[PDB]
Ligand binder design. Structure first.
Ligand SMILES: Cc1nc(N)sc1-c1ccnc(Nc2cccc(-n3oo3)c2)n1
Length: 289
């Protein structure tokens, strides 16, 4: 398929201004995107999105300023682009690229019965492209889940990663602070309070692939503790009836990502090179159907 259209502006090195977003942007009070408001640069008319991030402490503010700093290093059509930013006493506002007619990926997944395997393959190439770019820029996402991915267009199969709240430049000995409420997306290293790295994102890629193919969450149990049990036992399978009709390649792909031990997971770059995502004679057969 066709690569996503770029932001209508060139990639910027954004630094947060002291002052009110209101002084340079008209923020919509009725159009809410996810808090995220539609907005418009007053001077130019340019249509953008405004994420008001509430910040209690200095540490909260510092987390957002890291987020800005990270977006600054990420220039790619599958990664939402920062346009401007504003800091007040109680919040930092980010102004970002706006995608007209976006649908969040948890929606796409709720409607997984719509998707052929080829549709998912194509969405997956794009998701991997975004992650491959982040990793080759030495950056970890660390929060890759359907609610953080926007389906730009269903037909063209185009996506944009739209939040970098936990993203950071790679360092050794990176331990995350985590909470076990609704933990189905957590990598086992995050659950075990171990260090995170590039494979931490690849686990999530595995999870998303499983979910697009079946509409089911691979590690969900009847409650949070039972879900944690599944993650720590790395307990999952492709025995559900949704998986009966999928290719062997698909099955091998997920098997190379849902691995408890980090170092064994394939990279983003390898994921793209994998027969599920790269094999033309397979995609052809898939189209014929
Ligand atoms: C940053 C962000 N966070 C969301 N939850 S949506 C979002 C975002 C950022 C930029 N552009 C858009 N586009 C957009 C436009 C119109 C609707 C919607 N959606 O899903 O509800 C999204 N959405």
């Amino acid at each position: 398929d066709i690569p996503a259209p770029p932001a209508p502006f060139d990639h910027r090195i954004v630094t947060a201004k002291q002052g009110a977003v209101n002084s340079f942007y008209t923020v919509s009070k009725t159009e809410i995107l996810g808090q995220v408001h539609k907005c418009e640069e007053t001077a130019t008319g340019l249509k953008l999105a405004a994420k008001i991030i509430k910040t209690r402490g200095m540490k909260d503010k510092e987390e957002v300023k890291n987020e800005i700093s990270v977006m600054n290093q990420l220039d790619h059509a599958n990664l939402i682009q920062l346009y401007d930013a504003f800091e007040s006493k109680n919040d930092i506002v980010l102004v970002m690229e706006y995608v007209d007619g976006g649908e969040l990926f948890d929606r796409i997944i709720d409607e997984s019965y719509n998707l052929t395997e080829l549709d998912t393959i194509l969405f997956m190439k794009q998701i991997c492209e975004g992650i491959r770019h982040m990793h080759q820029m030495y950056i970890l996402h660390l929060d890759l889940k359907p609610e953080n991915i926007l389906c730009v267009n269903r037909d063209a199969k185009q996506i944009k990663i739209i939040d970098f709240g936990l993203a950071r430049r790679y360092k050794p000995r990176e331990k995350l602070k985590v909470n076990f409420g609704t933990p189905e997306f957590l990598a086992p290293e995050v659950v075990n309070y171990d260090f995170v790295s590039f494979p931490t994102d690849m686990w999530s890629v595995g999870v998303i692939a499983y979910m697009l193919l079946s509409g089911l969450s691979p590690f969900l149990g009847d409650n949070d503790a039972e879900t944690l049990n599944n993650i720590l036992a790395c307990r999952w399978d492709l025995e559900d009836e949704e998986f009966q009709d999928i290719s062997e390649e698909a099955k091998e792909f997920i098997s190379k990502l849902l691995i408890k031990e980090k170092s064994w997971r394939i990279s983003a770059s390898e994921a793209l090179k994998h027969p599920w995502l790269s094999d033309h004679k397979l995609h052809s057969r898939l189209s014929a159907q």
